[PDB]
UniProtKB/Swiss-Prot annotation, chain A:
Keyword Aminoacyl-tRNA synthetase: no
Keywords tagged on the record: Ribonucleoprotein, Ribosomal protein, RNA-binding, rRNA-binding
Subunit-level organization: Part of the 30S ribosomal subunit. Forms a tight heterodimer with protein bS6.
UniProt keyword rRNA-binding, yes or no: yes
Gene name of the record: rpsR1
Molecular-function annotations in GO: small ribosomal subunit rRNA binding; structural constituent of ribosome
GO CC annotation terms, alphabetical: cytosolic small ribosomal subunit
GO BP term, example: translation
Protein's recorded name: Small ribosomal subunit protein bS18A
Similarity comment: family membership: Belongs to the bacterial ribosomal protein bS18 family.
Source domain of life: Bacteria
Organism for this UniProt entry: Mycobacterium tuberculosis (strain ATCC 25618 / H37Rv)
Function: Binds as a heterodimer with protein bS6 to the central domain of the 16S rRNA, where it helps stabilize the platform of the 30S subunit.
From Swiss-Prot, chain B:
Function per UniProt: One of the primary rRNA binding proteins, it binds directly to 16S rRNA where it helps nucleate assembly of the platform of the 30S subunit by binding and bridging several RNA helices of the 16S rRNA.
Gene Ontology CC annotation, any one: cytosolic small ribosomal subunit
Molecular-function GO term, any one: structural constituent of ribosome
The protein's assembly and partners: Part of the 30S ribosomal subunit. Forms a bridge to the 50S subunit in the 70S ribosome, contacting the 23S rRNA.
Top-rank taxon, per record: Bacteria
Native organism: Mycobacterium tuberculosis (strain ATCC 25618 / H37Rv)
The protein's name: Small ribosomal subunit protein uS15
Keyword Ribosomal protein: yes
Keyword rRNA-binding listed: yes
A biological process term (GO) from this entry: translation
Curated annotation (Swiss-Prot), chain C:
Source taxon at top rank: Bacteria
Organism: Mycobacterium tuberculosis (strain ATCC 25618 / H37Rv)
Binding partners and assembly: Part of the 30S ribosomal subunit. Interacts with proteins S7 and S18. Binds to IF-3.
Protein name, entry field: Small ribosomal subunit protein uS11
Residues of the full protein shown: 23 to 139 of 139
GO biological process: translation
Assigned keywords, A-Z: Ribonucleoprotein, Ribosomal protein, RNA-binding, rRNA-binding
Region (Disordered): 96-117
GO cellular component terms attached to this protein's record: cytosolic small ribosomal subunit; plasma membrane
Claim: RNA-binding is one of the keywords in the record: yes
One example GO MF annotation: structural constituent of ribosome
Residues spanning the membrane: none
Similarity comment: Belongs to the universal ribosomal protein uS11 family.
Gene: rpsK
Summary of the function given for this chain in its UniProt record: Located on the platform of the 30S subunit, it bridges several disparate RNA helices of the 16S rRNA. Forms part of the Shine-Dalgarno cleft in the 70S ribosome.
Curated annotation (Swiss-Prot), chain E:
GO molecular function, one term: small ribosomal subunit rRNA binding
Protein species of origin: Mycobacterium tuberculosis (strain ATCC 25618 / H37Rv)
Pfam family for this entry, one: Ribosomal_S6
Gene Ontology terms describing biological process: translation
rRNA-binding listed as a keyword: yes
Keywords per UniProt: Ribonucleoprotein, Ribosomal protein, RNA-binding, rRNA-binding
The protein, known as: Small ribosomal subunit protein bS6
InterPro entries to which the protein is assigned, alphabetical: Ribosomal_bS6, Ribosomal_bS6_CS, Ribosomal_bS6_sf, Ribosomal_S6_plastid/chlpt, Transl_elong_EF1B/ribsomal_bS6
Ribosomal protein is among the record's keywords: yes
SUPFAM superfamilies assigned: Ribosomal protein S6 (SSF54995)
Superkingdom of the organism of origin: Bacteria
UniProt GO cellular component terms: cytoplasm; peptidoglycan-based cell wall; plasma membrane; ribonucleoprotein complex; ribosome
Length: 63, 87, 117, 272, 95
RNA sequence: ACUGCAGGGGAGACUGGAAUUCCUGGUGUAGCGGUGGAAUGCGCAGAUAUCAGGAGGAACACCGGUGGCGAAGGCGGGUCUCUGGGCAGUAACUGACGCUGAGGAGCGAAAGCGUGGGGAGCGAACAGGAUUAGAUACCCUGGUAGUCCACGCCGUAAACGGUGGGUACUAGGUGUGGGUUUCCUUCCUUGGGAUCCGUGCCGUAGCUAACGCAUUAAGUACCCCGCCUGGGGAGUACGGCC
């Protein structure tokens, strides 16, 4: 888990450069087992991705 | 709710000796404040059954404590009833 | 009497039929020959042979209108989903890119009940 | 909001009445009152043109302001919510800051004491009156004008509202309470919000006398008349009318709107 | 008073000049109620990931206010009521 | 009590996009739909298909699991407001204030009921087609109540772990969620050990008719409560309460 490995690296819905990973090529959130995030940081990533999609910084579906 | 300082005014007013937090009187005062506040919460949101259950648990605990203080010292019991309220 | 050099091919392949429609890049249809339009009927409309026949019919009808290259959008859980592309290729058209546009709800409308067959 | 009578007499068994809890100052404003007299459904010839009217309590008209044009930018304060026998909605008395008294139809959520604004620079709050150009789409409005400066005509009953659909060039699209899509000029005015007293339709009048008070006279079914009086009359026992249902003047049921009326250009979809 | 972070998307037809003074009124509605406005950072035009109100562009602004909940509710009601605002998103920078 | 911690726990308000349906317009022409195979059906008065715009309701893909929270029923689009409980650490406070609980009260899936609203999709009843000896069904085409919302009622489920609550004790092995913590403190490993609270699998003693349970007991004991006494008749009649 990167966020456990190095602390004080905030997850936020405005940091699209960090959220570009953890989303598939089609814009779907990557599974926990393929990114190695812990449960809490996986939840944080999913929340940030959902908010970014909602506020239109990321596509809902990059078909 | 009941932030730290908010509990502090109650503890200063109802505790016994400058550090009392677990006496029956202090506990009954805190429970009464929580019960009141949760009652104004429940006047709106009539369908918050999950919080009404917490209200019920607090009421039960306060009833045990009032019974205990009545058993142990009726004068303290009477003074606390007059300071807070009954029935 | 039209002339559209570049177009799009939509192939809707269901469990019961297949429809091939050729449009201009703006969404206006040129030719649309389908599996039932080709001589077929009933459950034969789902076989890959019917799909490739319909693809040939549509491809030649569009070439008659002046199409040389089509982009392909396929959708549906059909069987002729690749045979139609192959027929479009080997009936005088070049396809290039192929896209999947099967509609995927985000857990929306309730589906019909499961068949107890 | 509806109070139910106890079944003390046969005439009050299922009856109900308003609680009148929103009403303050049970008396009207003396300078805004004009007289009315009943007409029994009689026209200038003295003949009955509308049946089933007459009787009923004496009423006094209260001057309702349906224009709201001359006080743009002047704010008003709601002083009282009062009863009005002439409509189903309650009315509010406004004290303008210049010192003028006016009645407007009380919207939903216009408690006494609130401030009310008019004109293009007013907030989108219940009781504010704006031109349709200034109201964002998707808003519930009432007391809408059909022509600029013509006065409020649409959505004045209790509980009514009009849902503003959108403004294209110079026309607004409205969904009226009947559910039909009409198109009006964007220079028309409307009041923001929904008309109050929305629960009054649940009132059960208990007895015939209570309707006589409101001024409705009894209605005789046409099938228990004689053939000279109604097309449904006649028969030996009781009948269904010996023909397809018709009006007392022989008109059959069916659409009665003029087919080539001049306002068809403004009607997008007829009601369902 | 709590720390809130309001991010706004505005109509691309607006020029990036009058945007700073335009929202000063929505900031004064907070200042009168007795809040603080720390950073009013502006991002400028960016291409939205999808069509919002038939605009493929928009001006992103972050408000970063700190005031009472009723004041913030009044603020975002006024913004959503405004015609130049496309989207509004209010969050708490603390828990 | 203080300090931290995790959480689809609850209620209210606002709000997002995918998709289905319908409406308007463009292109366009003869089929579409459906099945084991068909027919009913829709269409040729311009359908299906495809593109743009609009309306409206309901459910929230990926995250997502065996995982979390809740007394149970149950709980996952987002944000804000209000609100309940749990765990760990400290040991600051009270000083047995505990446990259970007949009756009683509250909560309690879905279907159902009342008043009002809403109604995309699905779909009891109902209709047609098909199959069949028949087909009041299964399959197909439609389709009303209902499903949704507000406010009340109802009080039942294979409401299940088919296992009442509390407490102590009795080998281990191996996953996973939430803490604390020295040492190995970098062996950067966020690995190992120790401890507390959960949630799984496997296993000794022991228990069991057997199946199996097995530190989350169905083992060893103590406290309180509910229930059983052959199968039907019957959770039915009569009486009563709601
Ligand atoms: Mg005369
Ligand atoms: Mg009449
Ligand atoms: Mg009659
Ligand atoms: Mg007679
Ligand atoms: Mg006569
Ligand atoms: Mg006659
Ligand atoms: Mg007759
Ligand atoms: Mg007769
Ligand atoms: Mg007869
Ligand atoms: Mg009849
Ligand atoms: Mg609700
Ligand atoms: Mg429809
Ligand atoms: Mg069309
Ligand atoms: Mg179409
Ligand atoms: Mg001591
Ligand atoms: Mg108990
Ligand atoms: Mg009992
Ligand atoms: Mg209940
Ligand atoms: Mg139900
Ligand atoms: Mg109902
Ligand atoms: Mg019924
Ligand atoms: Mg109803
Ligand atoms: Mg159906
Ligand atoms: Mg069916
Ligand atoms: Mg039948
Ligand atoms: Mg039972
Ligand atoms: Mg269950
Ligand atoms: Mg049982
Ligand atoms: Mg137990
Ligand atoms: Mg036990
Ligand atoms: Mg474990
Ligand atoms: Mg035995
Ligand atoms: Mg086992
Ligand atoms: Mg046993
Ligand atoms: Mg019985
Ligand atoms: Mg009985
Ligand atoms: Zn982590």
């Amino acid at each position: 888990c990167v966020f456990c490995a190095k602390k004080d690296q905030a997850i936020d819905y405005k940091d699209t450069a960090l959220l570009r990973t953890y989303i598939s090529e089609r814009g779907k959130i990557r599974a926990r087992r393929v990114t190695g995030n812990c449960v809490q940081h996986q939840r944080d990533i999913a929340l940030a991705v959902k908010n970014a999609r909602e506020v239109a910084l990321l596509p809902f579906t990059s078909s | 709710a009941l932030t730290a300082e908010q509990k502090k005014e109650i503890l200063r007013s109802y505790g016994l000796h400058e550090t009392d937090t677990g006496s029956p009187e202090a506990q009954i005062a805190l429970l009464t404040k929580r019960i009141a506040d949760l009652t104004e919460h429940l006047k709106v949101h009539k369908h918050d059954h999950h919080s009404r259950r917490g209200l019920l648990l607090l009421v039960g605990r306060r009833r045990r404590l009032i019974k205990y203080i009545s058993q142990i010292d009726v004068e303290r019991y009477r003074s606390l009833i007059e300071r807070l309220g009954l029935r | 009497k039209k002339n559209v050099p570049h177009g799009a091919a939509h192939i809707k392949s269901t469990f019961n039929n297949t429809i091939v429609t050729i449009t201009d890049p703006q969404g206006n249809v040129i030719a649309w020959a389908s599996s039932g339009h080709v001589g077929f009927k009933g459950s034969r409309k789902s076989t890959p042979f019917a799909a490739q026949l319909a693809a040939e019919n549509a491809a030649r009808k569009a070439q008659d209108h002046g199409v040389r290259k089509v982009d392909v959008f396929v959708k549906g859980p059909g069987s002729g989903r690749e045979t139609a592309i192959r027929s479009l290729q080997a009936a005088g058209l070049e396809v290039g890119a192929i896209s999947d546009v099967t509609p995927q709800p985000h857990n929306g409308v309730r589906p019909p009940k499961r068949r107890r067959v | 909001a509806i109070r139910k009578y106890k079944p003390t007499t046969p005439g009050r068994r299922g009856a109900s009445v308003s609680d009148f809890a929103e009403i303050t100052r049970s008396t009207p404003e003396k300078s805004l009152v004009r007289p009315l007299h009943g007409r029994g459904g009689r026209n200038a010839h003295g003949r009955i043109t509308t049946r089933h009217k007459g009787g009923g309590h004496k009423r006094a008209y209260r001057m309702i302001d349906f224009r709201r044009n001359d006080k743009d930018g002047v704010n008003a304060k709601v002083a009282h919510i009062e009863y009005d026998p002439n409509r189903t909605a309650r009315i509010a008395l406004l004290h303008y800051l210049d010192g003028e008294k006016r009645y407007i139809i009380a919207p939903n959520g216009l408690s006494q004491g609130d401030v009310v604004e008019s004109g293009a620079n007013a907030d989108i709050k219940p009781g504010n009156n704006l031109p349709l150009r200034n109201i964002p789409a998707g808003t519930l409005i009432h007391a809408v004008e059909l022509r600029p400066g013509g006065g409020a005509k649409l959505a004045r009953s209790a509980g009514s509202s009009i849902q503003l659909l959108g403004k294209e060039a110079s026309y607004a699209s409205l969904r009226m309470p009947s559910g039909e899509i009409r198109r009006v000029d964007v220079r028309c005015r409307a009041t923001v919000g929904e008309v109050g007293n929305a629960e009054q339709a649940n009132i059960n009048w208990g007895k015939a006398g209570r309707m006589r008070w409101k001024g409705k006279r009894p209605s005789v079914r046409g099938v228990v008349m004689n053939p000279v009086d109604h097309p449904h009359g006649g028969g030996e026992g009781k009948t269904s009318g010996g023909r397809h249902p018709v009006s007392p003047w022989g008109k059959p049921e069916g659409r009665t709107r003029n087919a080539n009326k001049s306002s068809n250009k403004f009607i997008v979809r007829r009601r369902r | 008073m709590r720390p809130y972070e309001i991010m706004v998307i505005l109509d691309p037809t607006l020029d990036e000049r009058t945007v700073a003074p335009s929202l000063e009124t929505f900031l004064n509605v907070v200042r009168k109620d007795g809040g603080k406005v720390e950073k009013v950072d502006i991002w400028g035009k960016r291409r939205l990931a999808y069509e919002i109100a038939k605009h493929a562009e928009g001006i992103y602004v972050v408000i970063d206010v700190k005031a009472a909940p009723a004041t913030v509710s009044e603020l975002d009601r006024q913004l959503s009521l405004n015609e130049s605002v496309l989207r509004t998103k209010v969050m708490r920078t603390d828990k």
